[PDB]
Design a protein around this nucleic acid. Structure first.
Ligand SMILES: Nc1ncnc2c1ncn2[C@H]1C[C@H](O)[C@@H](COP(=O)(O)CP(=O)(O)OP(=O)(O)O)O1
Ligand SMILES: [Mn+2]
Ligand SMILES: [Mn+2]
Ligand SMILES: [Mn+2]
Ligand SMILES: [Mn+2]
Ligand SMILES: [Mn+2]
Ligand SMILES: [Mn+2]
Ligand code: NA
Ligand code: NA
Length: 326
DNA sequence: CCGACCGCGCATCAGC
DNA sequence: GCTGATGCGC
DNA sequence: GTCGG
């Protein structure tokens, strides 16, 4: 964090463009510029120094020059102050409330936790849960507690069928001291490309995790994806652990490695990879690795037995999960 | 100087 | 009632 | 907002 002040600035700018301006590409743009600087090995002494890097253009060098000089950004003070921009910004921190919804509420005077509290009957199931665990959801998860969760998940999965291979991923697999949530990749022999579609492969496990009382709430549940709420059990009469977010995705067996790659990220890493795999002549997606023909056609899915295998195809130094945090 | 930058699985709901 | 349109988190 | 075309 040699350039920490700059990348924090870039980040707030991102959220702004994404939550208020509803311009997902400026968001990405700032998001990208930050990751590039947050990986530069020197301490940025000017905006021009930063302008050398790919992802940092004129406006960001200009902003960097102010931040360096002044010590703050005028454009951000304005944002920070403006009530509306400031309010939409807040709402989006509730799970289930994105730009559009937050912008709507604010336009109807609802702009704070208390307001959502008053107008509760004007929120979908997901937004209610969101508000209900507002504080809980913004808390990071100690890597230790993850382990205890990685134990209850992996375990309970076995109890449904010993053939299930539940692999915890995300920044956790990347070996992180804490994680925003718990992402679980799930597979089973009876489910691959072909499959004939096995009904309730995910249902049974979701169900079982609710049996022991580990999964307390459902934000969404389909045939291959579940977004919900879980909670580590408490000793006796201590204090309930914070309620945590859990995502579980059932992927076809012969796509595991490719999916385990995607779901481990980092997200920006994935932006990076699904980008250099094109200059090499391929096209990665969370499900497969495909070659690009003449005009660029989805060639058949190449065989994959390791993450390393995916790197080989695109000729990139194999990087361990821990070094993919970008 | 202009246009691409992943798009997908799920829930909800305007319009009929 | 059904469903195309859209919003949401990742 | 950026950078490649
Ligand atoms: N916009 C995006 N484009 C492409 N891939 C994306 C993505 N957002 C998320 N991903 C992929 C890679 C993440 O590692 C993986 C997990 O997505 P995630 O949002 O659960 C966050 P994680 O990386 O686990 O850290 P943490 O904040 O939760 O502790 O999902
Ligand atoms: Mn150097
Ligand atoms: Mn009020
Ligand atoms: Mn995660
Ligand atoms: Mn997740
Ligand atoms: Mn333009
Ligand atoms: Mn439909
Ligand atoms: Na540059
Ligand atoms: Na949100």
């Amino acid at each position: 964090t040699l350039n920490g002040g700059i990348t924090d600035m870039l980040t707030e700018l991102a959220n702004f463009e994404k939550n208020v301006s509803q311009a997902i590409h400026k968001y990405n743009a700032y998001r990208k510029a930050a990751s590039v600087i947050a990986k530069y090995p020197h301490k940025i002494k000017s905006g021009a120094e930063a302008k050398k890097l790919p992802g940092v253009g004129t406006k960001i060098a200009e902003k960097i020059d102010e931040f360096l000089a002044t010590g703050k950004l005028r454009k951000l003070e304005k944002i920070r102050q403006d009530d509306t921009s400031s309010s939409i910004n807040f709402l989006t921190r509730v799970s289930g409330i994105g730009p559009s919804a937050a912008r709507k509420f604010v336009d109807e005077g609802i702009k704070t936790l208390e307001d959502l509290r008053k107008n509760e009957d004007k929120l979908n199931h997901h937004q209610r849960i969101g508000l209900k665990y507002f504080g809980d959801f913004e808390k990071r998860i100690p890597r230790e507690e993850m382990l205890q969760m990685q134990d209850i998940v992996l375990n309970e999965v076995k109890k449904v069928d010993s053939e299930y291979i539940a692999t915890v991923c995300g920044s956790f697999r990347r070996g992180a001291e804490s994680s925003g949530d718990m992402d679980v990749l799930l597979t089973h022999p009876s489910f691959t490309s072909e499959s004939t579609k096995q009904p309730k492969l995910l249902h049974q496990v979701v169900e079982q995790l609710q049996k022991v009382h580990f999964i307390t709430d459902t934000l969404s549940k389909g045939e291959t994806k579940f977004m919900g709420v879980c909670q580590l059990p408490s000793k006796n009469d201590e204090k309930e652990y914070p309620h945590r977010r859990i995502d579980i995705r059932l992927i076809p067996k012969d796509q595991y490695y490719c999916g385990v790659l995607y779901f481990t990220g980092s997200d920006i890493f994935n932006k990076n990879m699904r980008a250099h795999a094109l200059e090499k002549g391929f096209t990665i997606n969370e499900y497969t690795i495909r070659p690009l023909g003449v005009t660029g056609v989805a060639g058949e899915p190449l065989p994959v037995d390791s993450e390393k295998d995916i790197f080989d195809y695109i000729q990139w130094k194999y990087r361990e999960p821990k070094d993919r945090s970008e």
